[PDB]
């Protein structure tokens, strides 16, 4: 019963291992194993539940263990292991074959098979940790191992894609440990974690690997947002070390999502508005990306309110996420209607929900935007309006208070009007007829560059699938 | 944080206190290069000072800053200025990079100088800072019985 | 290890040969468009 269970999953694990084993030996095929490793994460997660944990026990016995002797015992000690044929050397799948990692040449140390075996061994260990949700000592014990090993081992172009997915598990398992319980040893692990990301990023710069460097950047930018220090992130994004070539579909929208949050407190909404829009188009529409689309669309609606312009409220309805978008509808309604008491009572009840996404701090500053939008609505209606007519509609304090607030709207060129103190009315200075200026040419010059930018993208992509088929023989 | 306040203290008095301040910075030179980027004009301005004896440790700090800034050629100048804190025998990706850049800069200069004089390697025509690492690394490959790097670069 | 330093010079040769054709093809396609409009 239990004997046939261990041989079934181990044969499928070697079958998938031999596919990427022979491809990395000749030249560089690494593009092909990268596609296989994408599905390997999903196929292994479903397979870990079946046949219990015994699929990874005989896999270490098959190959040679450089560091992994005590790692499997320590990983299986917390679950109160039940020992069945636990003596090492029970299952031998090698039997002296070239693709089987021939033993005599391996035991005599005349050849080194540890490079591809050990780096792949750490991948299967991190998968069971996230599947079984093993925390506390098991998280810190594996961190003391992989990091010193990556410093001694020098990865080639194909080998840099192995640990690229391991850095995500180190940061993911660390954040779940801090939020679960607060202990004195929690931040001691984060200090070394923050210093380790900067040391390995220095080496990956010369490797020119797209997935390796881009995976760390999105993990480093998230750490800066938790501490709330832009000075570390400001110079970090100015170097432009983020590879734009191949992020696949995972890192497309993750990079632009951080720039929208950083520039939100920079008081520049021109560039931040484009980053949040590009994050929506680059993010997949599937169910696994719904967690990202939930937080991203909530940030886009908050940026528009900070710009002074009322966005489209139809997104709060036709979308299927409106259950979580209900608190944000009353915020825009209070800013549009200009009611002072409605905005104060709206943020009071939903303050608990705004604490999770940390958007309540931006909602406090929406108190000013209620007046910013209210002035824009009343100004467009009446070109010449009396000074006391504004205080009657918005129920303001006095005439000296509104005189200061209207002067704040034309600061950046929003309203573009003038205040006449002696005449007693505010007159709009916008005569339209802007076509006589150079403004139409300013937009058309970018459309030509944007059209040729899409041309330059299509300019050079054809031959990539044609390299394999034209070089190989065809019927 | 950490050494961030220590970067602006270089304008104060008591240069003996600056000795202990630069030692704590030597740990963070490979960690956070952002705060140092604003203090780079102040670090280089102290190099030519005759009363500043810490240029050995000062050049070690800027060696890993301009390198992380994205300028590989600039980090070679600071590494060859002190000729002390730079460890040629230390095994790291940072040390192996300067060696590759210093030898590459030596080939570009010695390429057009071979026509004028063939004795340039016996004279000061080429910067002795470039010949310091170049001469030692080729002799190191000879002791390792490697003719690929020794004869390949010489050609 | 002999092919490592031998192909090092070939890397610059393959780059220049592709650049020379790329520079000459711009002047060649100009005469191609003139013959099409002439017919």
């Amino acid at each position: 019963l239990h004997h046939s269970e261990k041989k079934y999953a181990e044969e499928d694990q070697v079958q998938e291992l031999l596919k990427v084993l022979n491809e990395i030996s000749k030249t560089t095929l690494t593009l092909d194993p990268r596609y296989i490793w994408r599905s390997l994460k999903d196929l292994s997660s479903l397979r870990n539940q079946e046949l219990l944990n015994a699929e990874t026990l005989c896999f270490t016995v098959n190959v040679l263990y450089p560091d992994s002797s005590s790692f499997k015992k320590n990983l299986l000690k917390f679950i109160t292991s039940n020992h069945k044929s636990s003596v090492p050397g029970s299952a031998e799948l090698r039997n002296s074959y070239p693709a089987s990692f021939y033993s005599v040449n391996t035991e005599k140390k005349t050849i080194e098979v540890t490079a591809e075996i050990n780096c792949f061994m750490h991948l299967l260990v991190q998968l069971f940790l996230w599947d079984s949700k093993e925390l506390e000592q098991l998280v810190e014990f594996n961190r003391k191992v992989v990091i010193p090993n990556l410093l001694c081992y020098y990865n080639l172009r194909s080998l840099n894609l192995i640990n690229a997915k391991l850095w995500f598990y180190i940061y993911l398992s660390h954040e779940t440990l801090a939020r679960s319980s607060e202990e004195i040893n929690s931040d001691n692990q984060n200090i070394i974690l923050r210093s380790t990301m900067m040391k390995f990023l220095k080496i990956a710069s010369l490797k020119h690997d797209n997935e390796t460097k881009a995976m760390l950047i999105n993990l480093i930018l998230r750490d800066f947002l938790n501490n709330g220090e832009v000075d570390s992130a400001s110079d970090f994004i100015s170097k432009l070390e983020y590879p734009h070539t191949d992020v696949s579909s995972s890192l497309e929208a993750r990079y632009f999502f951080y720039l929208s949050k950083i520039n939100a407190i920079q008081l520049d909404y021109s560039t931040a508005n484009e980053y949040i829009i590009a994050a929506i188009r680059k993010a997949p529409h599937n169910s696994k990306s719904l967690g990202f689309l939930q937080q991203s669309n909530k940030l886009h609606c908050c940026i528009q309110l900070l710009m002074g312009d009322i966005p489209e409220l139809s997104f709060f309805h036709q979308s299927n996420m409106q259950k979580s978008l209900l608190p944000y509808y009353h915020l825009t309604k209070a800013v549009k209607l200009g009611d002072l008491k409605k905005f104060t009572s709206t943020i009071t009840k939903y303050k608990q929900l705004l604490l999770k996404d940390d958007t309540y701090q931006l909602c406090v500053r929406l108190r000013s935007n209620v007046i910013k939008t209210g002035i824009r609505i009343i100004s467009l209606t009446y070109k010449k309006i009396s000074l006391r007519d504004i205080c009657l509609k918005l129920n303001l304090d006095s005439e000296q208070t509104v005189e200061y607030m209207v002067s704040r709207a034309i600061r950046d060129g929003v309203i573009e009007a003038k205040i006449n103190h002696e005449d007693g009315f505010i007159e709009t200075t916008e005569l339209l007829n802007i076509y006589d200026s150079e403004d139409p040419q300013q937009v058309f010059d970018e459309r030509i560059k944007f059209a040729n930018q899409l041309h330059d993208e299509y300019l050079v992509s054809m031959r990539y699938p044609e390299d394999k088929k034209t070089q190989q023989n065809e019927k | 944080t950490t050494a961030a306040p220590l970067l602006a203290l270089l304008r104060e008095n008591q240069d003996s206190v600056k000795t202990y301040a630069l030692e704590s910075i030597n740990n963070v030179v490979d960690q956070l290069w952002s705060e140092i980027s604003n203090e780079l004009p102040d670090i280089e301005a102290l190099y030519d000072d005759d009363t500043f004896s810490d240029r050995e440790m000062a050049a070690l700090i800027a060696s890993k800053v301009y390198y992380n800034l994205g300028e590989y050629e600039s980090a070679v100048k600071y590494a060859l200025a002190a000729k002390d804190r730079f460890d040629i025998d230390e095994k790291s990706q940072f040390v192996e990079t300067i060696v590759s850049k210093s030898i590459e800069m030596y080939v570009q200069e010695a390429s057009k100088q071979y026509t004028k004089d063939e004795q340039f390697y016996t004279k000061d025509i080429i910067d002795p800072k470039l010949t310091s690492i170049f001469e030692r690394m080729i002799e190191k490959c000879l002791k390792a019985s490697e003719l690929k790097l020794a004869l390949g670069i010489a050609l | 290890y002999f092919k490592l330093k031998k192909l090092e010079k070939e890397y610059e040769l393959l780059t220049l040969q592709e650049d020379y054709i790329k520079d000459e093809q711009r002047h060649l396609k100009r005469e191609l468009k003139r013959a099409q409009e002439e017919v």
Partner: peptide
């Protein structure tokens, strides 16, 4: 081979750029 491996990407980059511009010339 630090410089050889680093400059190897320029070989595949310029090769894929020139071949895809030959199809336009071969079409003309």
């Amino acid at each position: 081979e630090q410089k050889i491996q680093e400059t190897e990407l320029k070989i595949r980059s310029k090769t894929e750029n020139v071949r895809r511009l030959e199809a336009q010339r071969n079409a003309l």
